[PDB]
Amino acid sequence: SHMNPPPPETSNPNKPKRQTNQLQYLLRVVLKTLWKHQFAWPFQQPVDAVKLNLPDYYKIIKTPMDMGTIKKRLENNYYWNAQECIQDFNTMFTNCYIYNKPGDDIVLMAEALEKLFLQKINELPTE
């Protein structure tokens, strides 16, 4: 009976756009590497609380984020600063750590993805 919210916005035509080495790197290296990982599939789209039978997910998670949203934002030049993209990644991980219990398979998957994310953003070009 519960409903999913609308996904996060991925495009704003009033927001100015720019292409920096950091953002291109975040799309082509960081996002692409995480997207192909064995554990990416639960994070490639917004959490569907209806299809997954999680009536309390959006009562606990008020800041949803997923890699599909991040990919679409990068592709639309929605981010102006790279820190917006990094914050979205961190928010996705944090949502998974808060909603689920430690030791759940999804949390271990998210932790592996976060380790890879930190390894990949270590080599981020300068501003």
Calculate the CA dihedral of residues 32, 35, 38, 42 and round it to 10 degrees.
170
Calculate the CA dihedral of residues 58, 62, 65, 66 and round it to 10 degrees.
-20
Q: What's phi and psi for 119, nearest 5 deg?
A: -60, -40
Distance of alpha carbon 70 from alpha carbon 90, whole angstroms? 11
SS3 28: helix
Q: Which two tokens stand for residue 51?
A: 């299809």
How many C-beta atoms lie closer than 10 Å to residue 77's C-beta?
17
Distance of alpha carbon 46 from alpha carbon 103, whole angstroms? 22
Distance of alpha carbon 101 from alpha carbon 35, whole angstroms? 24
Nearest to 74 by CA among 66, 83, 85: 85
Resolution value in angstroms: 1.9
- Cα separation of the two ends of the chain: 47
Catalogue all structural domains in the chain, each as residue range(s) with its CATH number.
21-122 (1.20.920.10)
Nearest to 30 by CA among 94, 89, 112: 89
The string over 30-63, giving b where at least 16 C-beta atoms fall within 10 Å of a residue's C-beta and e elsewhere, is: bbeebeeeebeebbeebbebeeeebeebbeebee
**Residue linked to tokens 């990644």:** 89
Contact predicate 65/57, CB 8 Å: no
Calculate the CA dihedral of residues 84, 51, 95, 41 and round it to 10 degrees.
-70
Distance of alpha carbon 93 from alpha carbon 63, whole angstroms? 11
Nearest to 73 by CA among 6, 9, 21: 9
Q: At what angle do helices 82-99 and 105-121 cross, to 10 degrees?
A: 160
Nearest to 68 by CA among 48, 90, 100, 45: 45
Q: What's phi and psi for 51, nearest 5 deg?
A: -70, -20
Distant-in-sequence, close-in-space partners of 14: CB < 8 Å, separation ≥ 6: none
